[PDB]
Design an enzyme around this catalytic site. Structure first.
Site, PDB file in Angstrom:
ATOM      1  N   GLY A  30      26.695 -13.219   0.893  1.00 40.30           N
ATOM      2  CA  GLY A  30      25.465 -13.310   0.284  1.00 40.30           C
ATOM      3  C   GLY A  30      25.379 -14.591  -0.174  1.00 40.30           C
ATOM      4  O   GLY A  30      25.240 -15.662  -0.731  1.00 40.30           O
ATOM      5  N   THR A  31      23.509 -14.591   0.298  1.00 40.15           N
ATOM      6  CA  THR A  31      22.771 -15.718  -0.538  1.00 40.15           C
ATOM      7  C   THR A  31      23.135 -15.669  -1.964  1.00 40.15           C
ATOM      8  O   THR A  31      23.587 -14.896  -2.637  1.00 40.15           O
ATOM      9  CB  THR A  31      21.160 -15.096  -0.735  1.00 40.15           C
ATOM     10  N   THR A  32      22.750 -16.985  -2.226  1.00 39.69           N
ATOM     11  CA  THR A  32      22.827 -17.340  -3.859  1.00 39.69           C
ATOM     12  C   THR A  32      22.058 -16.956  -5.104  1.00 39.69           C
ATOM     13  O   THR A  32      20.493 -16.841  -4.172  1.00 39.69           O
ATOM     14  CB  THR A  32      23.455 -18.532  -4.079  1.00 39.69           C
TER      15      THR A  32
END
Lengths: 244, 233
Positions: A30-32
């Site tokens: 996933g996105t950071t």
């Protein structure tokens, strides 16, 4: 034998719960997102990949508030994140209703902790596909936390999770070393915008949108608020400037 | 089914050209015992709404908790919480009215008389009443308990019908309200001299005045009165 990874609450021969471990994969994919504890508050920032020009900018907010003094951000399966926050909200409302005082961050952390750990106790449920960074200010200071799909959590000085967690953690460690005295809410907001930018290299392919929020005893009066307008751009620039 | 224990008396209100005014004293009675004196019965919600409550105090405190929650909950995942999507006075009222009627319908009422005063986003004034039976109504002036009998007659002399609203100023209105509070202090045995008053103006916002006191009372003529019929000294 094998197959110890097909059912959620099963212990593998080496004492592991493979389904929780696979949940982690969904998180790392996933996105950071990060969190930074300052001298009187905490800051939350997250990467928002711009799938296309069609996404109305600034509209798909990811950071969520719990009660009025807590912020929550997470990386992984977004729906699972919302689910966990809804629980946190019911959990905070319940605590306030009985004890009058809004829920202390440590207390709140365990509420999310126990709930998440509960989802690793039966094969009738799936573990949470998100690592959550959250915190706020309370009767005795600021607190930052990170909760893993296993239900494991600890208090942090700085924290990151998602695709670029390594870059972020590297940056956070520098800050920790170069500021034993403590960063300020104002500083943390910028520093957070930078780390999100740096950590965006592990996804430099797609364009993104920056999102920050904070809760500072002096800057927001202990209430969780989103960073908007001037203070936001000023942080965006501070990043764009140090990205070169 | 229950019975009120600690109670708050009248709550009076009216609307003027730019907004609404609502007032309520600070007493918390326990039967004929004027037991508590620092009770605030005007509850501000956001900055465009004030909820005035009379009746059972324990239930009032419950409605307070409910209102605080409404604010908290409305803020959740709401980027326009302090803008286009903030709580409107009409939303706060419809909510409370819903609760009031559901509770009387379960034969377990919140023993109160409530008046929600505020200014809508489009500038329109808001004044509506709801009580323990779930009954609701609007009028240029609204009062609960004793105030319904003594405040409305005075307040209606200022705004008798809708068309009197634009012709009424905050000064006139606030004056009518303050005088009504004095009259209630004279004849209502469950009233207090101390009270709060709030104004929600579509231009000046929400003004909340605390610790007001009834002043300019006439008591001198009392010296002349003696006996109850024939006594002369």
């Amino acid at each position: 034998g094998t197959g110890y990874d097909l059912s959620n609450s099963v212990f593998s021969p080496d004492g592991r719960n493979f389904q929780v471990e696979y949940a982690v994969k969904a998180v790392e994919n996933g996105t950071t997102s990060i969190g930074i504890k300052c001298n009187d508050g905490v800051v939350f920032a997250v990467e928002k990949l711009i799938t296309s020009k069609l996404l109305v900018p600034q509209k798909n907010v990811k950071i969520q508030v719990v009660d009025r003094h807590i912020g929550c951000v997470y990386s992984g399966l977004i729906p699972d994140g919302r689910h966990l926050v809804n629980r946190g909200r019911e959990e905070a409302a319940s605590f306030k209703k009985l004890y009058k005082t809004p829920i202390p961050i440590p207390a709140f952390a365990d509420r999310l902790g126990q709930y998440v750990q509960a989802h690793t106790l039966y094969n009738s449920v799936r573990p949470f596909g998100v690592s959550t960074i959250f915190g706020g200010v309370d009767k005795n200071g600021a607190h930052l936390y990170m909760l893993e799909p296993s239900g494991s959590y600890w208090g942090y000085k700085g924290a990151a999770t998602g695709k670029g967690r390594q870059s972020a953690k590297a940056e956070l460690e520098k800050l920790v070393d170069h500021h034993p005295e403590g960063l300020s809410a104002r500083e943390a907001v910028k520093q957070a915008a930078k780390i999100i930018y740096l950590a965006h290299e592990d996804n430099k392919e797609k364009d993104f949108e920056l999102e920050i929020s904070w809760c500072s005893l002096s800057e927001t009066n202990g209430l969780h608020k989103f960073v908007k307008g001037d203070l936001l751009q000023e942080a965006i620039d501070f990043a764009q400037k140090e990205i070169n | 089914t229950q019975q009120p224990i600690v109670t708050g008396t009248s709550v009076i209100s009216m609307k003027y050209d730019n907004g609404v005014i609502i007032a309520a004293d600070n007493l918390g009675s326990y039967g004929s015992l004027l037991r508590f004196n620092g009770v605030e019965r005007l509850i501000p919600v956001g900055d465009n709404t004030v909820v005035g409550i009379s009746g059972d105090i324990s239930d009032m405190q419950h409605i307070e908790r409910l209102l605080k929650d409404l604010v908290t909950e409305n803020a959740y995942d709401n980027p326009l919480a302090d803008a286009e999507e903030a709580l409107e006075p009409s939303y706060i009222f419809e909510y409370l009215a819903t609760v009031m009627y559901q509770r009387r319908s379960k034969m377990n009422p919140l023993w109160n008389a409530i008046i929600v005063a505020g200014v809508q986003s489009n500038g329109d004034q808001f004044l509506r009443y709801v009580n323990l039976l779930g009954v609701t109504y609007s009028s240029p002036t609204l009062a609960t308990g004793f105030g319904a009998h003594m405040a409305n007659p005075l307040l209606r002399k200022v705004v008798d019908r809708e068309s009197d609203i634009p012709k009424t100023t905050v000064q006139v209105a606030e004056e009518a309200i303050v005088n009504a509070m004095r009259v209630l202090y004279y004849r209502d045995a469950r009233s207090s001299r101390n009270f709060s008053l709030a104004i929600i103006d579509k231009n000046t916002g929400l003004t909340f005045k605390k610790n007001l006191q009834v002043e300019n009372m006439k008591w001198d003529f009392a010296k002349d009165i003696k006996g109850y019929g024939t006594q002369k000294i």
